[PDB]
């Protein structure tokens, strides 16, 4: 109930997912149904219950500060589709139309 | 009409390896040669917490008079950007390793205790070189352990801001966890400023100042911004939330964007890193691993070895300088003599020769002599003119 | 394709007694594949050449009488969301088609160390989101017991390749049931060890706090063996548990008289079909005929498992899947001229419908104004779900009930109905939420389609799970049926 075009496009943006106003409507409803589905948790009594962030009760797992040489540039770029001069190449025209 | 401003400062910890990856923290000039699957954010990689980075983060927070957390976990700060591959920076939101501390500063007038609200651990982002209509991306620096220090919004003028950066830099420098040099990026700073006319609680426009690269430079933007929204408040002004870039050449701040609200980073606990439980023993080890900081080191130069005001501040500006001074002192250099010799003479020699490595050149063993040869041995000063330089960039005694 | 139906154990000994050459064992595997997968469609990338080579190396070692490794010369299929150095790993997504890992996951490391033989990668739902493997960008795996049915999700290829006699063992990943549900649908043995029992280094992340790798086999024993080869702490995974006792076969073959077994009433609730329910109750009786003591108990917060699981899983996914921008690897949109387009176009074109649904939900559940009411709430609910188990475990050794509410459903039956698809996780999600170990073994068949019996254990008590599972298996199993399909 009440999930507007606007929120749908604000989320798409927070997620960097391209969507068409021919997908937005469809997504507004989907989310809505999913949320209604999600709303089921509200019937659960959590007053005073601490959130579970970790299921395993470990503690202080740290790594000694000893460097390990990195892989070759060649290995690091091997899977990237666009590269130039040993780096990753990407568009950067900052115009509030594109961005 | 207080101009309220706070400072967001990041410091680069100088560890061997990165914060959540074994890759070295120091890299060569070859791009993307200082990485691994972790720094490259490959699918299925995990973060592994650098132990020393924690010890140093909580060493610098104590030196900052902060309450050290007992429970401290990491969180993800989610955002998409070429130099941040995972699309989330592992940081801390609640439970920052250090909270509510302060530092004392002297600004025109007297002493003002400025609060520091928090100190948390983060990882640095990679660098994005803007070439042509494209962008080049080097992940060599990605993952470098940083710590974020946010002042309480207590500082009250572009000058108090400078004094703040100086003392802070000074204190962090003494803990030996960072060279904290802004020309080297091991110390960065962003400022937030807003004006609220007296008698009322409402503020005018609020701005985040970006691209402030030097202590001297933050002041410029700070005091320019101050005047900029000073007009806005009076003339007509349209209240708003904004981010502004400081133009080094023109000295003005340029509006680079107007916030539509509060940047949503979807902060949430990092499940891949088990929580940290910092006990007393642990806190002790690092407690004791702290020298005498500048303030109490300076208060030591006041009544004991009763030196001046100016003197105390500049001799405690760096640990090395202050160590040099005290090593040279017992050696046989009259208190004042060396003070005046370091204050100016050596300080001016360093700046004029950029010989900032006060350690691999002239030594307290060597310098100690010169001051005696002047003290009484041979007679007085002018000879000191060139004996000093040579003795500084060359040999060992007169 | 002659030993293609032999168990890991027997195949193991058949190789140690030099009654068979590793190179021929593999020849049989690929023969099986070539003949059967065209119909089953459970395999994605095949690693035949490398496999061939490794076996040739194993023949020498055989001859020299130096056969080391718990899984020497044993064939293995690996879910395609588990990284394999040099082998195309796709997570069954367009986003990663053609992706060749430049590092080795920890379980594969461990598996090579034991001299297993990588036969290939298995099909699955895209990025482990789905309950039928139908979302794969590549193909739809089918249930060996019924070709009109789904194999389950997300590890359908792992459950199908084993049930179809293509490999004696396979790995899967379970986030909310992705190992146990496919196993239940394909009538095989699948286990999701305790959270922390198996390194996640090299597991393409779905939900970091819920994810976990585990094995799938044709019998309880082969399964325990495989778990011993992948369990253990790892300096590459901070959440990996420092528990040395990685022996799971020691108590197998031992009786279960006196074993205190809890049968949650909620596990036989309204969402459970009539046939699944009848089979599990006959299973309860079987356990009684074996001495175990079975009594009803309640896990009241069960009903909240699916929703709290989707909110948590989706949320984490909305963060673990963000690295996919087609910059350093993966799908890279060609029609992008701006940086915003590059992220938005690559991601929208590279991800399938279901994956984008989760991300949408997850991103929304974590956003400003909703965080406390959705994500935080779910995490609190997560606490409730675990407390339920903590309580039951105060008086019971294990917990039993059905793995899935129904038999496997039809291909295309719920592919366009995500909500009903989700309902299939009713009985599996509480386990990951509590971080417990849970195992599924067959316990029946309704119209030919297998039904699953699940045993949930205390943390790191997989051995007790294998003990009771083995006992039950001596009374019922489908050991002789696979051979006939
Ligand atoms: Mg920061």
UniProtKB/Swiss-Prot annotation, chain A:
GO molecular function: asparaginyl-tRNA synthase (glutamine-hydrolyzing) activity; ATP binding; glutaminyl-tRNA synthase (glutamine-hydrolyzing) activity
Keywords tagged on the record: ATP-binding, Ligase, Nucleotide-binding, Protein biosynthesis
Function: Allows the formation of correctly charged Asn-tRNA(Asn) or Gln-tRNA(Gln) through the transamidation of misacylated Asp-tRNA(Asn) or Glu-tRNA(Gln) in organisms which lack either or both of asparaginyl-tRNA or glutaminyl-tRNA synthetases. The reaction takes place in the presence of glutamine and ATP through an activated phospho-Asp-tRNA(Asn) or phospho-Glu-tRNA(Gln).
HAMAP family recorded: GatC
SUPFAM superfamilies given in the database record: Glu-tRNAGln amidotransferase C subunit
Quaternary organization: Heterotrimer of A, B and C subunits.
An annotated GO BP: translation
Similarity remark: Belongs to the GatC family.
Protein name per UniProt: Aspartyl/glutamyl-tRNA(Asn/Gln) amidotransferase subunit C
Curated annotation (Swiss-Prot), chain B:
GO molecular function, one term: asparaginyl-tRNA synthase (glutamine-hydrolyzing) activity
Transmembrane segments: none
Domain of life: Bacteria
GO BP terms: glutaminyl-tRNAGln biosynthesis via transamidation; translation
Catalytic activity entry: L-glutamyl-tRNA(Gln) + L-glutamine + ATP + H2O = L-glutaminyl-tRNA(Gln) + L-glutamate + ADP + phosphate + H(+); L-aspartyl-tRNA(Asn) + L-glutamine + ATP + H2O = L-asparaginyl-tRNA(Asn) + L-glutamate + ADP + phosphate + 2 H(+)
EC number: 6.3.5.-
UniProt keyword annotations, A-Z: ATP-binding, Ligase, Nucleotide-binding, Protein biosynthesis
Subunit (UniProt): Heterotrimer of A, B and C subunits.
Stated role: Allows the formation of correctly charged Asn-tRNA(Asn) or Gln-tRNA(Gln) through the transamidation of misacylated Asp-tRNA(Asn) or Glu-tRNA(Gln) in organisms which lack either or both of asparaginyl-tRNA or glutaminyl-tRNA synthetases. The reaction takes place in the presence of glutamine and ATP through an activated phospho-Asp-tRNA(Asn) or phospho-Glu-tRNA(Gln).
Family in the record: Belongs to the GatB/GatE family. GatB subfamily.
Record protein name field: Aspartyl/glutamyl-tRNA(Asn/Gln) amidotransferase subunit B
Lineage of the organism: Bacteria, Bacillati, Bacillota, Bacilli, Bacillales
Swiss-Prot record, chain C:
Pfam families: Amidase
Domain of life (superkingdom): Bacteria
Residue numbers annotated as active site: 79, 154, 178
Presence of keyword Repeat: no
Keywords annotated in UniProt: ATP-binding, Ligase, Nucleotide-binding, Protein biosynthesis
Gene Ontology molecular function terms on file: ATP binding; glutaminyl-tRNA synthase (glutamine-hydrolyzing) activity
EC numbers for this chain: 6.3.5.7
Listed GO CC annotations: glutamyl-tRNA(Gln) amidotransferase complex
Ligase found in the keyword field: yes
EC category: ligase
Catalytic activity, as annotated: L-glutamyl-tRNA(Gln) + L-glutamine + ATP + H2O = L-glutaminyl-tRNA(Gln) + L-glutamate + ADP + phosphate + H(+)
One of the GO BP terms on file: translation
Subunit field text: Heterotrimer of A, B and C subunits.
Similarity comment text for this entry: Belongs to the amidase family. GatA subfamily.
Job of this protein: Allows the formation of correctly charged Gln-tRNA(Gln) through the transamidation of misacylated Glu-tRNA(Gln) in organisms which lack glutaminyl-tRNA synthetase. The reaction takes place in the presence of glutamine and ATP through an activated gamma-phospho-Glu-tRNA(Gln).
PANTHER family from the UniProt entry: GLUTAMYL-TRNA(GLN) AMIDOTRANSFERASE SUBUNIT A, TRANSAMIDASE
Protein name: Glutamyl-tRNA(Gln) amidotransferase subunit A
Organism: Staphylococcus aureus (strain Mu50 / ATCC 700699)
Gene name per UniProt: gatA
């Amino acid at each position: 109930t009440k999930v507007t075009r606007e929120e749908v496009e604000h989320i798409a943006n927070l997620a960097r997912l391209q969507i068409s106003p021919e997908e937005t409507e469809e997504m507004a409803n989907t989310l809505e149904s999913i949320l209604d589905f999600a709303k089921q948790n509200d019937s659960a009594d959590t007053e005073g219950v601490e959130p579970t962030y970790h299921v395993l009760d470990l503690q202080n797992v740290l790594r000694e500060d000893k460097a390990i040489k990195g892989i070759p540039q060649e290995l690091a770029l091997k899977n990237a589709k666009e590269t130039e001069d040993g780096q990753f190449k990407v568009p950067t025209i900052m115009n509030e139309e594109d961005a | 009409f207080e101009t309220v401003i706070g400072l967001e400062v990041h410091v680069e910890l100088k560890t061997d390896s990165k914060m959540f990856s074994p890759s070295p923290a120091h890299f060569g000039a070859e791009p993307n040669s200082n990485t691994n699957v972790i720094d490259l954010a490959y699918p299925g990689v995990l973060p592994v917490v650098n132990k020393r980075a924690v010890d140093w983060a909580m060493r610098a927070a104590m030196a900052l008079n902060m309450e050290i957390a007992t429970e401290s976990k990491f969180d993800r700060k989610n955002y998409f950007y070429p130099d941040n591959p995972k699309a989330y920076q592992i940081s801390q939101f609640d439970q920052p390793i250090g909270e509510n501390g302060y530092i004392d500063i002297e600004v025109d007038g007297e002493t003002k205790r400025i609060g520091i609200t928090r100190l948390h651990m983060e990882e640095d982002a990679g660098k994005s070189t803007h070439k042509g209509e494209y962008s080049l991306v080097d992940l060599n620096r990605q993952g470098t352990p940083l710590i974020e220090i946010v002042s309480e919004p207590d500082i009250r003028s572009p000058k108090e801001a400078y004094a703040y950066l100086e003392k802070l830099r000074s204190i962090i420098q003494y803990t030996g966890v960072s060279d904290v040099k802004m020309e080297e990026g091991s110390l960065r700073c962003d400022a937030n400023i807003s004006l609220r006319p007296y008698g009322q609680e409402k503020f005018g426009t609020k701005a985040e100042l970006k691209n402030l690269n030097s202590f001297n430079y933050v002041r410029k933007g700070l005091e320019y911004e101050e005047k900029r929204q000073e007009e806005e408040l009076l003339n007509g002004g349209e209240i708003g939330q904004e981010t502004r870039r400081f133009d080094e050449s023109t000295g003005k701040t340029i509006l680079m964007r107007v916030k539509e609200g509060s940047d949503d980073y979807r902060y949430f606990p990092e499940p891949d890193i088990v929580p940290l439980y910092i006990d007393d023993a642990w806190k002790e080890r690092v407690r004791q691993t702290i020298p005498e900081l500048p303030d109490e080191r300076k208060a030591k130069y006041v009544n004991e070895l009763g030196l001046p005001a100016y003197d105390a501040h500049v001799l405690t500006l760096t640990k090395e300088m202050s160590d040099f001074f005290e090593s040279t002192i017992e050696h046989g250099a009259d208190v004042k003599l060396t003070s005046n010799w370091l204050m100016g003479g050596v300080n001016e020699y360093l700046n004029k020769n950029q010989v900032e490595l006060l350690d691999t050149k002239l030594t307290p063993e060597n310098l100690a002599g010169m001051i005696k040869l002047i003290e009484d041995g041979t007679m007085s000063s002018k000879i000191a003119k060139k004996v000093f330089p040579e003795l500084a960039a060359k040999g060992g005694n007169a | 394709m002659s030993i293609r139906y032999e168990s890991v154990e027997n195949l193991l000994t058949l190789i140690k007694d030099k009654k068979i050459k590793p190179s021929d064992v593999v020849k049989d595997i690929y023969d099986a594949i070539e003949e059967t997968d065209p119909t089953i469609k459970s395999f994605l990338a095949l690693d035949k050449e490398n496999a061939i080579k490794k076996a040739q190396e194993l023949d020498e070692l055989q001859a020299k009488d130096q056969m080391d490794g718990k899984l020497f010369g044993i064939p293995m299929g690996i879910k395609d969301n588990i990284i394999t150095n040099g082998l195309e790993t796709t997570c069954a997504s367009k986003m990663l088609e053609g992706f060749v890992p430049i590092y080795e996951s920890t379980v594969m490391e461990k598996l090579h160390k034991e001299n297993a033989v990588l036969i290939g990668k298995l099909n699955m739902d895209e990025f482990a989101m789905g309950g039928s493997t139908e979302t794969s960008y590549f193909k739809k795996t089918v249930n060996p017991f019924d070709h009109k049915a789904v194999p389950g999700g997300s590890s359908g290829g792992s459950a199908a390749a084993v049930a179809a006699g293509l490999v004696p063992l396979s790995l899967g990943s379970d986030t909310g049931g992705s190992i146990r549900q496919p196993a239940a649908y394909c009538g095989v043995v699948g286990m999701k060890p305790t959270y922390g029992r198996v390194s996640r280094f090299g597991l393409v992340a779905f939900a970091s706090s819920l994810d976990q790798i585990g094995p799938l086999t044709r019998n309880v024993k082969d399964n325990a063996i495989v778990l011993e080869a992948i369990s253990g702490a790892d300096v590459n995974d901070s959440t990996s548990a420092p528990v040395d006792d990685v022996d799971f076969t020691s108590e197998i073959g031992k009786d279960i008289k006196g074993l205190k077994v809890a049968l949650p009433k909620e596990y036989l609730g309204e969402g459970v079909a009539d046939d699944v329910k009848e089979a599990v109750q006959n299973a309860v009786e079987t356990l009684k005929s074996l001495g175990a003591v079975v009594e009803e108990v309640s896990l009241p917060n069960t009903k909240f498992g699916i929703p709290s699981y989707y909110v948590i899983a989706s949320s984490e996914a909305s963060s673990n899947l963000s690295r996919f921008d087609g910059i350093r690897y993966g799908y890279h949109s060609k029609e992008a001229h701006s940086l915003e387009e590059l992220y938005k176009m690559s991601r929208s074109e590279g991800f399938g419908k279901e994956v984008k649904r989760r991300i949408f939900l997850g991103t929304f559940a974590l956003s400003s104004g909703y965080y406390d009411a959705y994500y935080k709430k779910s995490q609190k609910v997560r606490t409730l779900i675990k407390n339920d188990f903590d309580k039951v475990f105060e008086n019971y050794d294990v917990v039993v009930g059905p793995t899935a509410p129904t038999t496997a459903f039809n291909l295309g039956e719920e592919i366009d109905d995500p909500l009903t698809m989700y309902a299939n996780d009713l009985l599996t999600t509480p386990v990951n939420l509590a971080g417990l170990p849970g195992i599924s073994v067959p316990c029946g068949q309704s119209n030919g389609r297998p039904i699953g019996l699940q045993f949930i254990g205390k943390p790191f008590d997989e051995k007790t799970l294998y003990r009771v599972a083995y006992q039950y298996e001596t009374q019922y199993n489908l050991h002789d049926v696979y051979e006939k399909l």
